[PDB]
Design goal:
Two copies of one chain form a homodimer. Chain A contains 18 helices and 21 strands. Chain A is α/β, with parallel strands linked by helices. In chain A, the strands form five sheets. A six-stranded mixed β-sheet of chain A has the order 8-13-12-11-9-10, with helices on both faces. The two termini of chain A are about 55 Å apart. The structure holds ligand JLN, aminoimidazole 4-carboxamide ribonucleotide (2 copies) and potassium ion (2 copies). Chain B: InterPro entries: AICAR_Tfase_dup_dom_sf, Cytidine_deaminase-like, MGS-like_dom, MGS-like_dom_sf, PurH-like.
Chain lengths: ~525, ~525
């Protein structure tokens, strides 16, 4: 088992939470406590005897208190080797079985908005060196870096020490915390201490760590395994969603929920988005209710909504839940659910019901690629051209207020559709969506075929300019009255002429919204 | 700015050390060093103060604690801006270090060749990182160099009367990046090898990674978004390490498309060329003749969509292929290499980005970030039990002739790279109709048939997921498709099998799914 009885413990903690309880426990079991500064005073003020580190070393400007061989030899001596044991005995140095250290809170000093000098001062040197030394010498030493493990220490103390397996685990955790601490120190120094000139949108180095939340049902396909990880520092998202009902989440369930969440919060009005394979099959807004927004979004493409992922940018009502319960739905994500809505959704056993925190706009997006990573600013639909006031009317009569709000809806909805994308919309609802096409005219053909009869009199949005007039002709031939696209082709006037010939209102934004 | 008087050197890699040491010694700098670093310097006749003289502590525990001493760290950590700290050093008899040169044993680089658990544990450096962190924390006084790359900078600093405060801040920032990279590597190895969890978990409880900026891209997904490319120095080279031989700067989409085209091409054993548009193939083809034949076949699938496409070949691009690529509007071409004269033919068009990438190593993990976290999965290597045609179930119709079967295997493997819901119609080792990224399976079948046109009659088809209803299969059968391959697995499978039986279509069930997003 490899249990070693605890005889000497080295305690040097910034956070003194649970320290007196731990110290009482250790002292009662005849453990010698060796401690530094304010940790030693906290213990001694209770009457518990404590050996100062200065008595061990015989050396007294603060910043270098435990960086001494009479500390580190006791931590690093491999007691499995006779020659290391003999060296300690000859130097009159005893080993430490237990090392309890928690570091200067650097990330919290930064989080409180302290100066450069104050944050630099909270960079611990001795602490990580003690933790790494005890972690490296896990066959002999046990290292605890959080007051959470203190009852584990008193339990191990009662059991005649920690096992070898327990000490390996503690060492592994110790090195994770040191890596997290250093990521935080390196990230802050790059940003605040030594930034680039001229200041750059993305830094020269990027580092992050995550903690496993759960194993998923499977990956993108059942022969692939997958896991979900959370970023404890980040603002809560889908990775922190609360599951209130249903079978376990798969990888695709999470990617779809994330895509549906983003598509719903891309609208100011009450909005419901229905997603299939990271693409919307139906999006709608309402000035009436969530239920009306869900009905409109579902009626766009009921055949595709089968096994869909639903997101609402407001509380799901009982009225909406009743309709969702009659449709095959895999996932529903919302900022909350009205009294009785969860019970209506729970009528179907498998549907995953999630509660998520409302999104925080203006972040950076990570996109991994083979051998590396792409980092970009997220498309927040806030470009100069995303404001309809900044649109250029290329041909036709200006849109009436109802036609314009539909154009803004179709325009904002085209962001979430994978490229090449065409969104045909009317009365704040999509009627035909042409997604993920390798050419623009096929995306226009798709949206027209799906839209069916509802295309006549509707508006359309193109996420990129029409390179040739055929894509626009497809929409005009189907009865689309107004079209909004970025413009920007050398062939723009051919496209504008085709819309002029058809008597179609055409707007140019100068802003593009590809998504993949 | 501070003149360098005392330097602390402890380097694993001794590259440029003697040139640095002769530079420092000539400028009257006292070198404080230990072990093999001190011998390398002394063997040249350059005087060196051993760390053991400074500490006065004997040779114990295989050097595990040699520099963890206050006469080392007080010299590093004394804030010389505080008269009190400067007064403390005098009262204790400890001099300051203006320069700290430390390079560690390459832990990350040797985990793959780590002899045992005990040997890797022994390689964990304690003193080294503590010296680097201490000098980095005390950057207002100390300069910390962790790579022989910065030695030229040190000699230049010696000529100008020391490093500036701004230079020392930058060095400290780099020092902490290297420390963080070292610790990510030690933490990752301990989780995996030292203390793994029981029962066996495919993905560990903690995951950490860092990247280094390679370049700023033309723009992000759209021009109003900025973007940058980062590389993983520990990983096997991929698209992030590609060498650009020609063309305008790469955009974010150029890289995502190149990555998708690279993966689609290496999904085939035979000579293969994939043409991608918005992360989806518009044309894929294999050849037993040449790369040029594979590119022509793939381009013929959909020439209108190949306009502004991203091309990947899983073999060397020939002159013959470059000559056809030069007549077509192409944004990016990625290949493991180019034949003599092929690059010159490609360079006839100014803007085309010509890239050379390392052949991929199968069986890795994929990262997919989501709001507030990350999804990690095993990559789909097309090696499931059902990916072997020998393990397919013939549900109806006559068994496929050898030519029909090889086309089915091609269509099947090609359907992996197409975004879901996906349908691939193929013939003679080439796609003729691709239905991609559809919110419903029957629309993906309709797309593939409309694009395929006349070519669909007599061709084979592959579905990346089962047909939930017979309509998607009826669409293919009504168009003249002779054989179809899909996973099966629906409660409605027999309705789908009956529809194929009614049409006299050969139908195979694999039991393996290949969604991609
Ligand atoms: O960077 C300095 N940190 C060091 C050192 C050293 O630099 O020699 N020794 C112990 N520590 C840490 O000091 C804190 C505990 O000391 P107190 O007991 O006085 O609060 C805890 O945060 C311990 O990490
Ligand atoms: N056979 C199909 O077309 C199919 N099978 C499942 N799905 C949908 O794929 C999504 C991912 O399913 P899984 O959670 O099995 O990864 C869920 O929306 C699901 O209804 C399909 N479109
Ligand atoms: N207007 C369009 O449909 C369009 N404009 C550009 N593109 C293609 O988008 C891809 C990415 O372009 P960029 O690098 O600008 O992001 C390249 O293939 C490019 O030819 C389009 N499909
Ligand atoms: K889009
Ligand atoms: K696929």
């Amino acid at each position: 088992d490899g249990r070693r009885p605890i005889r000497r413990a080295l305690i040097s903690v910034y956070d003194k939470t649970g320290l007196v309880d731990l110290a009482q426990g250790l002292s009662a079991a005849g453990v010698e406590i060796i401690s530094t500064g304010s940790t030693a005073k906290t213990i001694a003020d209770t009457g518990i005897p404590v050996t100062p580190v200065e008595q061990l070393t015989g050396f007294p400007d603060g910043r270098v208190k435990t960086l001494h061989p009479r500390v580190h030899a006791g931590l690093l001596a491999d007691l499995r080797k006779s020659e290391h044991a003999a060296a300690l005995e000859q130097l009159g140095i005893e080993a430490f079985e237990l090392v309890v250290v928690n570091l200067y809170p650097f990330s919290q000093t930064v989080e409180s908005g302290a100066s450069v000098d104050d944050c630099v001062e909270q960079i611990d040197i001795g602490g990580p060196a003690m933790v790494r030394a005890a972690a490296k010498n896990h066959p002999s030493a046990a290292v605890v870096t959080d007051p959470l493990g203190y009852h584990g220490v008193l339990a191990a103390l009662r059991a005649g020490g920690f096992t070898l397996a327990e000490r390996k685990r503690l060492a592994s955790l110790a090195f994770q915390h040191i890596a997290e601490y250093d990521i935080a120190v390196a990230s802050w120094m790059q940003q605040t201490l030594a930034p680039e000139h001229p200041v750059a949108a993305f830094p020269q180095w990027f580092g992050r760590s995550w903690r496993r939340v759960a194993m998923l049902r499977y990956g993108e396909n059942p022969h692939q395994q997958a896991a979900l990880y959370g970023d404890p520092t980040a603002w809560p998202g889908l990775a922190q969603a609360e599951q209130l009902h249903g079978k376990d989440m798969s990888y695709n369930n999470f990617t779809d929920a994330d895509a549906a969440w983003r598509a719903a919060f891309d609208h100011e009005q009450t909005c419901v988005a229905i997603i299939k394979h990271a693409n919307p099959c139906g999006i709608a807004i309402s000035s009436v209710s969530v239920a009306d927004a869900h009905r409109k979004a579902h009626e766009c493409d009921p055949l595709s909504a089968y096994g869909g992922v639903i997101a609402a940018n407001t509380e799901v009502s009982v009225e909406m839940a009743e309709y969702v319960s009659t449709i095959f739905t895999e996932v529903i994500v919302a900022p909350g659910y009205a009294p009785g809505a969860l019970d209506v959704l729970a009528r179907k056993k498998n549907i995953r019901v999630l509660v998520a925190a409302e999104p925080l706009a203006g972040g950076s997006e990570l996109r991994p690629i083979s051998g590396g990573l792409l980092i970009q600013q997220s498309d927040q639909l806030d470009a100069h051209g995303d404001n309809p006031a900044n649109w250029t009317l290329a041909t036709g009569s200006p849109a009436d207020p109802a036609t314009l709000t539909d154009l803004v809806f179709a325009w904002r909805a085209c962001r979430a559709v994978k490229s090449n994308a065409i969104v045909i919309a009317a009365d704040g609802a999509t009627v035909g969506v042409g997604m993920g096409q390798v050419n623009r005219v096929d995306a226009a053909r798709l949206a027209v075929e799906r839209g069916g009869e509802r295309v006549r009199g509707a508006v359309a949005a193109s996420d990129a300019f029409f390179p040739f007039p055929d894509g626009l002709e497809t929409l005009a031939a189907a009865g689309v009255t107004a079209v909004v696209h970025p413009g920007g082709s050398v062939r723009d006037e051919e496209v504008t002429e085709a819309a002029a010939k058809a008597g179609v209102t055409l707007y140019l934004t100068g802003a593009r919204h590809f998504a993949h």
